[PDB]
Every structure is written in structure tokens, then in C-alpha cells.
Design an enzyme around this catalytic site. Structure first.
Site, mmCIF file in Angstrom:
data_model
loop_
_atom_site.group_PDB
_atom_site.id
_atom_site.type_symbol
_atom_site.label_atom_id
_atom_site.label_comp_id
_atom_site.label_asym_id
_atom_site.label_seq_id
_atom_site.Cartn_x
_atom_site.Cartn_y
_atom_site.Cartn_z
ATOM 1 N N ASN A 283 0.842 -1.183 0.000
ATOM 2 C CA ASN A 283 0.000 0.000 0.000
ATOM 3 C C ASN A 283 0.882 1.239 0.000
ATOM 4 O OD1 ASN A 283 -2.317 1.571 0.175
ATOM 5 N ND2 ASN A 283 -2.511 1.335 2.400
ATOM 6 N N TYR B 254 -6.115 14.508 -2.829
ATOM 7 C CA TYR B 254 -5.989 13.839 -1.538
ATOM 8 C C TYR B 254 -5.495 14.823 -0.504
ATOM 9 C CZ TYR B 254 -3.620 10.792 1.912
ATOM 10 O OH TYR B 254 -3.194 10.163 3.061
ATOM 11 N N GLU C 173 -9.554 12.708 6.744
ATOM 12 C CA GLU C 173 -8.827 12.361 5.527
ATOM 13 C C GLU C 173 -9.820 12.386 4.374
ATOM 14 O OE1 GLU C 173 -7.463 8.349 5.363
ATOM 15 O OE2 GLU C 173 -5.653 8.899 4.253
ATOM 16 N N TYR D 230 -10.694 12.299 -0.129
ATOM 17 C CA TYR D 230 -10.322 11.941 -1.497
ATOM 18 C C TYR D 230 -11.384 12.387 -2.478
ATOM 19 C CZ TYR D 230 -7.658 8.419 1.115
ATOM 20 O OH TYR D 230 -6.852 7.773 2.014
ATOM 21 N N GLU E 117 -2.333 6.375 -5.625
ATOM 22 C CA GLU E 117 -2.362 5.370 -4.578
ATOM 23 C C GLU E 117 -2.271 4.011 -5.263
ATOM 24 O OE1 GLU E 117 -4.707 2.893 -4.274
ATOM 25 O OE2 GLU E 117 -4.892 2.355 -2.169
#
Lengths: 189, 188
Positions: free
Chosen positions: B42, B75, B84, B86, B175
Site C-alpha cells: 500500500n 488527496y 482524511e 479523497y 495510490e
């Protein structure tokens, strides 16, 4: 002359529901036929089919569907344990009823791709009373008012994405309206 | 370069990975960065601003070629409350909003976006391990170039009761999650 409620007509189960707003006439015809004529209606849904439905019924329908405004034509039904409401939408009017629902995926059946969705209904009317339950949608891309619906393809697609069927309740071909006018004449088998 | 944050050719950048290996993050001229990955874990990295703003119009252009799980997004984070977020412009083989709770829809910059929230529990963040909400806008019309009016998303989120605090960083990021791919993205 036919009031909101359920029963049988000419061998077929039927359900007719409205919000009491006026402006809808639901009629049962010979065999699997029903008609709806509406003018400045509130919310209603009515049609003919089976009680209970089944997980693999192939449902045939034919006729004319002429909404003027918000309306849809679907295989409409319920299941119990868990409580589920479902629609396989074959055609709609001026508003896509899946709007705002969560897309789960797609399925191909009976000559079209369908988009499948789910949304949560919170403290809403149901076959067992006010309740919170999931409502599943399968919306045909190629709109039509006759055809055949292999319900198993849609139940399988929904189940892939979280649906469980406990015991089936009613399963009908229905015309829904929401603050609109229109006419429809549909025959089920 | 190694996981970290900094400035390159006028732009803030952030690059994070899970230590698994299989990814190269490269800073390029101006607002450009590239990512090349192969059987990665990741990771997320890209260029933009520190802090971002609640009304920035963010322009991105280039090539995005994931082979597997990946997304391309605006992001960022906010503080107090810790959030957080996106705005996903494209993705690979998996919709990253899967399992998130849909709150609504917003139309912006040529597409309908689906809006979601979920909760991250005891997960890494800009302030350390924490529990916080994660906001998503996912573009239906996938693209790898375009313009994002962040205000349209932040305002739509607020209408669904998704408050934003004091802005932290705000980048265009690639990502990846156990996948391969390449990307070359220029931000302005």
C-alpha cells in the site's frame, strides 16, 4: 371502485396502495391484466402477480405504458427475514428512481444490461409495519413495456452484493406513480 | 526518494508506503511526479500544497496506467476535526468507495460524483495512530487530466453534515494497493 388493498382477481394476486392524495384509478381486467389511469396523483403503486412470489419465477408482461411525469414499471416485491423491498425496473418516466441509491454492480438479463443498487429505508411503511430495511433496485438500461423477466438473474446479482432471501412475500408487475399523470395497461403471466 | 514530505520545484509533496517494497516515487520538473510500481504493498504519493485551501481549483494532467488496485485523486487532510479526504478522478480494478456509506451526489467539472463517508479505526494519520472519518467523492466519468473545483466537493460534503476543520496538506496523488502500474502526473 377498487380501493387500496390486496386480494385476487381472475386468478392473479393484486396489490394496490396509495398515499390518499387522490387522482388515481386502478382497475383489474380479465386474466392477468390491470390498468391505471392517474392525474395529479400522489404516490401510488399497484399491479398483478403472485403471493408468494418465488426466487426463480420467469415473469412475462405485455402492454402499454404511458407516464407523463414521475413513474416506473417494474417487477415489485418483498421478502421477509430479512425484510427486503425490491424493484426490477423495466421502464420509467421523468425521473430515474435509482437516483441517490448506492450502485452495487451490473447484471445482464433478458436482452439488456441492468444497473443494480441498494438504499436504506428508515422507519418507512412496509408489509410488516413501520420499519427500517434495505431496498434493492435493478434498473434496465434498454427501456421497454413488454418482455420476460428471469427474476433469478436479479436475485443472484443482488445476493452477490449482500441480499439474503428468507421467505418470499408478494411479487407483482406494478405501475408506480409519484405526483404525476399517465395511463398504463399491462397483462401479466 | 524515501517516504517523507518536502518541497520540490515549488510544490509540496508527500510520499507514504507500508514498507512492503515494490514502488518508486519520483519528483519531476515543476509540478510533475511519477510513480512506477510492481507487486507493491500500500502506498500513496503526489504533489500539491501545504496547507491546501477550501476553495482551490486544482489542475492535473498526464498519464495514469494502473495494473490492479490503484486510484488517482485529490488527496488531503484537515485538523480539528481530523479528516482524511479523497476526490477520486480515476481508479483501477477496485472501487475504493466499496463498503463506504453513500451520503449523496454532486455534479462538478463535467461529471456526477458519488459522495461517501467511512470511519478509520486506530489507523495511521498525519498526527499518529487515530480514529477519524474519511470523506470520498468518486467521479463517475473516469479521467487522468482535468480541473477539480474543491469547493464544490467540500460544500457538498458539508451539506451532508461532513464538517472540515483547519486544512493540512492537499495534493494530487497516486495510490496503489498490492498491484503494479505507472503514472506521470503534472499538477498546477
Amino acid at each position: 371502485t377498487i380501493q387500496p388493498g390486496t386480494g385476487y382477481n381472475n386468478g392473479y394476486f393484486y396489490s394496490y396502495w396509495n398515499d390518499g392524495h387522490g387522482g388515481v384509478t386502478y382497475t383489474n381486467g380479465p386474466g392477468g391484466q390491470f390498468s391505471v389511469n392517474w392525474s395529479n396523483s400522489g404516490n401510488f403503486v399497484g399491479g398483478k402477480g403472485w403471493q408468494p412470489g418465488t426466487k426463480n419465477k420467469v415473469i412475462n408482461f405485455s402492454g402499454s405504458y404511458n407516464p407523463n411525469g414521475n413513474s416506473y414499471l417494474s417487477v415489485y416485491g418483498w421478502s421477509r427475514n430479512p425484510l427486503i423491498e425490491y424493484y426490477i425496473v423495466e421502464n420509467f418516466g421523468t425521473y430515474n428512481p435509482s437516483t441517490g441509491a448506492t450502485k452495487l454492480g451490473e447484471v445482464t438479463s433478458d436482452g439488456s444490461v441492468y444497473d443494480i443498487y441498494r438504499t436504506q429505508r428508515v422507519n418507512q411503511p412496509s408489509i410488516i409495519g413501520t420499519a427500517t430495511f434495505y431496498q434493492y433496485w435493478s434498473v434496465r438500461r434498454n427501456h421497454r413495456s413488454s418482455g420476460s423477466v428471469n427474476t433469478a438473474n436479479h436475485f443472484n446479482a443482488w445476493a452477490q452484493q449482500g441480499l439474503t432471501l428468507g421467505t418470499m412475500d408478494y411479487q407483482i408487475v406494478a405501475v408506480e406513480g409519484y405526483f404525476s399523470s399517465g395511463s398504463a395497461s399491462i397483462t401479466v403471466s
